[PDB]
Design a protein around this motif. Structure first.
Motif, PDB file in Angstrom:
ATOM      1  N   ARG A  87     -67.146 -57.076 -16.818  1.00  0.00           N
ATOM      2  CA  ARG A  87     -66.687 -56.335 -15.639  1.00  0.00           C
ATOM      3  C   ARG A  87     -65.372 -56.211 -14.967  1.00  0.00           C
ATOM      4  O   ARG A  87     -64.800 -57.325 -15.025  1.00  0.00           O
ATOM      5  CB  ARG A  87     -67.728 -56.536 -14.695  1.00  0.00           C
ATOM      6  CG  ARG A  87     -67.512 -55.799 -13.344  1.00  0.00           C
ATOM      7  CD  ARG A  87     -68.529 -56.292 -12.216  1.00  0.00           C
ATOM      8  NE  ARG A  87     -69.926 -55.188 -12.367  1.00  0.00           N
ATOM      9  CZ  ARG A  87     -70.920 -55.561 -13.018  1.00  0.00           C
ATOM     10  NH1 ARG A  87     -71.110 -56.571 -13.480  1.00  0.00           N
ATOM     11  NH2 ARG A  87     -72.074 -54.554 -12.987  1.00  0.00           N
ATOM     12  N   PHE A  88     -64.700 -55.233 -15.030  1.00  0.00           N
ATOM     13  CA  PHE A  88     -63.273 -55.153 -14.376  1.00  0.00           C
ATOM     14  C   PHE A  88     -63.734 -54.940 -12.688  1.00  0.00           C
ATOM     15  O   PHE A  88     -64.610 -54.658 -12.319  1.00  0.00           O
ATOM     16  CB  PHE A  88     -62.536 -54.029 -14.979  1.00  0.00           C
ATOM     17  CG  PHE A  88     -61.808 -54.333 -16.313  1.00  0.00           C
ATOM     18  CD1 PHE A  88     -62.593 -55.311 -17.132  1.00  0.00           C
ATOM     19  CD2 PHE A  88     -60.524 -53.885 -16.264  1.00  0.00           C
ATOM     20  CE1 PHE A  88     -61.698 -55.450 -18.151  1.00  0.00           C
ATOM     21  CE2 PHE A  88     -59.861 -54.241 -17.405  1.00  0.00           C
ATOM     22  CZ  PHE A  88     -60.405 -55.158 -18.430  1.00  0.00           C
ATOM     23  N   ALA A  89     -62.336 -55.149 -12.055  1.00  0.00           N
ATOM     24  CA  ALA A  89     -62.296 -55.121 -10.707  1.00  0.00           C
ATOM     25  C   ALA A  89     -62.116 -53.458 -10.438  1.00  0.00           C
ATOM     26  O   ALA A  89     -61.556 -52.661 -11.152  1.00  0.00           O
ATOM     27  CB  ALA A  89     -61.105 -56.093 -10.237  1.00  0.00           C
ATOM     28  N   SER A  90     -62.573 -53.256  -8.938  1.00  0.00           N
ATOM     29  CA  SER A  90     -62.448 -51.845  -8.471  1.00  0.00           C
ATOM     30  C   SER A  90     -60.815 -51.865  -8.244  1.00  0.00           C
ATOM     31  O   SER A  90     -60.389 -52.764  -7.840  1.00  0.00           O
ATOM     32  CB  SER A  90     -63.058 -51.849  -7.340  1.00  0.00           C
ATOM     33  OG  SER A  90     -64.578 -51.418  -7.604  1.00  0.00           O
TER      34      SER A  90
ATOM     35  N   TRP B 204     -57.946 -54.640  -6.914  1.00  0.00           N
ATOM     36  CA  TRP B 204     -57.481 -54.799  -7.977  1.00  0.00           C
ATOM     37  C   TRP B 204     -57.287 -56.548  -8.236  1.00  0.00           C
ATOM     38  O   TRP B 204     -56.580 -57.009  -7.610  1.00  0.00           O
ATOM     39  CB  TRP B 204     -55.951 -54.230  -8.686  1.00  0.00           C
ATOM     40  CG  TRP B 204     -54.985 -54.480  -7.317  1.00  0.00           C
ATOM     41  CD1 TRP B 204     -54.989 -53.809  -6.164  1.00  0.00           C
ATOM     42  CD2 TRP B 204     -54.244 -55.472  -7.506  1.00  0.00           C
ATOM     43  NE1 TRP B 204     -53.949 -54.268  -5.594  1.00  0.00           N
ATOM     44  CE2 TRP B 204     -53.359 -55.180  -6.191  1.00  0.00           C
ATOM     45  CE3 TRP B 204     -53.932 -56.514  -8.362  1.00  0.00           C
ATOM     46  CZ2 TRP B 204     -52.265 -56.029  -5.713  1.00  0.00           C
ATOM     47  CZ3 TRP B 204     -52.835 -57.250  -7.794  1.00  0.00           C
ATOM     48  CH2 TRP B 204     -51.944 -57.125  -6.721  1.00  0.00           C
ATOM     49  N   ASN B 205     -57.666 -57.066  -9.416  1.00  0.00           N
ATOM     50  CA  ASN B 205     -57.846 -58.574  -9.516  1.00  0.00           C
ATOM     51  C   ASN B 205     -56.427 -58.854 -10.341  1.00  0.00           C
ATOM     52  O   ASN B 205     -55.771 -58.120 -11.189  1.00  0.00           O
ATOM     53  CB  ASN B 205     -58.720 -58.726 -10.648  1.00  0.00           C
ATOM     54  CG  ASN B 205     -58.578 -60.314 -10.893  1.00  0.00           C
ATOM     55  OD1 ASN B 205     -57.980 -60.884 -12.033  1.00  0.00           O
ATOM     56  ND2 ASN B 205     -59.737 -61.186 -10.125  1.00  0.00           N
ATOM     57  N   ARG B 206     -55.935 -60.050  -9.939  1.00  0.00           N
ATOM     58  CA  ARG B 206     -54.670 -60.449 -10.397  1.00  0.00           C
ATOM     59  C   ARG B 206     -54.662 -61.965 -10.906  1.00  0.00           C
ATOM     60  O   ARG B 206     -55.392 -63.066 -10.556  1.00  0.00           O
ATOM     61  CB  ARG B 206     -53.518 -60.530  -9.581  1.00  0.00           C
ATOM     62  CG  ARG B 206     -52.400 -61.447  -9.702  1.00  0.00           C
ATOM     63  CD  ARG B 206     -51.095 -61.028  -9.000  1.00  0.00           C
ATOM     64  NE  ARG B 206     -50.571 -59.692  -9.388  1.00  0.00           N
ATOM     65  CZ  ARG B 206     -49.158 -59.518  -8.969  1.00  0.00           C
ATOM     66  NH1 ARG B 206     -48.589 -60.056  -7.787  1.00  0.00           N
ATOM     67  NH2 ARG B 206     -48.950 -57.958  -9.282  1.00  0.00           N
TER      68      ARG B 206
END
Lengths: 49, 49
Positions: free
Chosen positions: A3-6, A10-12
Protein backbone atom coordinates in the motif's frame (compact mmCIF):
# COMPACT_ATOMS: atom_id res chain seq x y z
CA UNK A 1 5.23 -1.96 -1.05
CA UNK A 2 1.69 -3.33 -0.82
CA UNK A 3 0.00 0.00 0.00
CA UNK A 4 1.28 3.44 -0.96
CA UNK A 5 0.70 6.72 0.87
CA UNK A 6 -1.87 9.31 -0.14
CA UNK A 7 -0.18 12.10 -2.09
CA UNK A 8 -1.36 14.75 0.40
CA UNK A 9 0.55 12.77 3.07
CA UNK A 10 3.38 11.50 0.85
CA UNK A 11 5.75 9.09 2.60
CA UNK A 12 9.52 9.66 2.81
CA UNK A 13 12.21 7.06 3.54
CA UNK A 14 15.85 8.02 4.15
CA UNK A 15 18.37 5.89 2.24
CA UNK A 16 21.87 6.07 3.73
CA UNK A 17 24.97 4.06 4.68
CA UNK A 18 24.35 1.61 1.85
CA UNK A 19 25.55 0.66 -1.64
CA UNK A 20 23.08 1.16 -4.50
CA UNK A 21 22.72 -0.33 -8.00
CA UNK A 22 20.53 2.12 -9.92
CA UNK A 23 21.08 0.06 -13.09
CA UNK A 24 18.77 -2.61 -11.65
CA UNK A 25 16.00 -0.01 -11.33
CA UNK A 26 16.52 1.73 -14.68
CA UNK A 27 16.95 -1.51 -16.65
CA UNK A 28 13.83 -3.02 -15.06
CA UNK A 29 11.74 -1.56 -17.94
CA UNK A 30 8.70 -1.88 -15.64
CA UNK A 31 8.22 1.90 -15.33
CA UNK A 32 6.14 4.05 -17.68
CA UNK A 33 8.04 7.23 -16.75
CA UNK A 34 11.65 7.63 -15.61
CA UNK A 35 12.82 11.26 -15.63
CA UNK A 36 15.93 12.62 -13.90
CA UNK A 37 16.82 16.25 -13.23
CA UNK A 38 20.43 17.38 -12.89
CA UNK A 39 21.69 13.76 -12.94
CA UNK A 40 21.96 11.41 -15.92
CA UNK A 41 20.20 8.04 -15.45
CA UNK A 42 23.19 6.11 -16.82
CA UNK A 43 25.91 8.00 -14.93
CA UNK A 44 23.82 7.84 -11.74
CA UNK A 45 25.38 4.43 -11.03
CA UNK A 46 28.93 5.86 -11.27
CA UNK A 47 28.42 8.50 -8.56
CA UNK A 48 28.14 8.81 -4.78
CA UNK A 49 25.72 10.87 -2.68
CA UNK B 1 22.99 14.07 -51.20
CA UNK B 2 21.49 10.77 -50.01
CA UNK B 3 18.46 9.65 -47.98
CA UNK B 4 18.09 6.48 -45.90
CA UNK B 5 14.66 5.17 -44.85
CA UNK B 6 14.70 3.01 -41.70
CA UNK B 7 11.58 1.04 -40.71
CA UNK B 8 10.65 -1.11 -37.70
CA UNK B 9 7.79 -1.84 -35.28
CA UNK B 10 7.82 -1.06 -31.53
CA UNK B 11 5.39 -0.50 -28.67
CA UNK B 12 3.55 2.81 -28.53
CA UNK B 13 5.32 3.54 -25.23
CA UNK B 14 8.68 3.08 -27.01
CA UNK B 15 8.18 5.71 -29.74
CA UNK B 16 9.47 8.33 -27.28
CA UNK B 17 12.84 6.52 -27.35
CA UNK B 18 13.26 7.16 -31.10
CA UNK B 19 14.96 10.55 -30.67
CA UNK B 20 18.55 11.80 -30.45
CA UNK B 21 20.23 11.35 -27.07
CA UNK B 22 17.62 8.86 -25.83
CA UNK B 23 18.34 5.78 -23.72
CA UNK B 24 16.53 2.56 -22.85
CA UNK B 25 16.19 -0.99 -24.12
CA UNK B 26 15.27 0.20 -27.62
CA UNK B 27 17.61 3.19 -27.86
CA UNK B 28 20.48 1.33 -26.17
CA UNK B 29 20.14 -2.15 -27.70
CA UNK B 30 17.97 -1.79 -30.83
CA UNK B 31 18.19 1.56 -32.65
CA UNK B 32 20.46 4.45 -31.61
CA UNK B 33 20.27 7.94 -33.22
CA UNK B 34 23.35 10.20 -33.27
CA UNK B 35 23.59 13.28 -31.09
CA UNK B 36 23.53 15.53 -34.19
CA UNK B 37 20.76 13.68 -36.07
CA UNK B 38 19.45 15.57 -39.12
CA UNK B 39 16.45 13.46 -40.23
CA UNK B 40 12.75 13.04 -39.42
CA UNK B 41 11.01 10.42 -37.25
CA UNK B 42 7.52 9.30 -38.34
CA UNK B 43 5.36 6.79 -36.46
CA UNK B 44 1.75 5.59 -36.46
CA UNK B 45 -0.41 3.04 -34.63
CA UNK B 46 -0.49 -0.33 -36.43
CA UNK B 47 -2.83 -2.28 -34.11
CA UNK B 48 -4.95 -3.01 -37.21
CA UNK B 49 -2.10 -4.86 -38.99
Amino acid sequence: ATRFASVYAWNRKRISNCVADYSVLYNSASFSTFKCYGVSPTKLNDLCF
Amino acid sequence: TNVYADSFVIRGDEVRQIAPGQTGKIADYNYKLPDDFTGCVIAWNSNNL
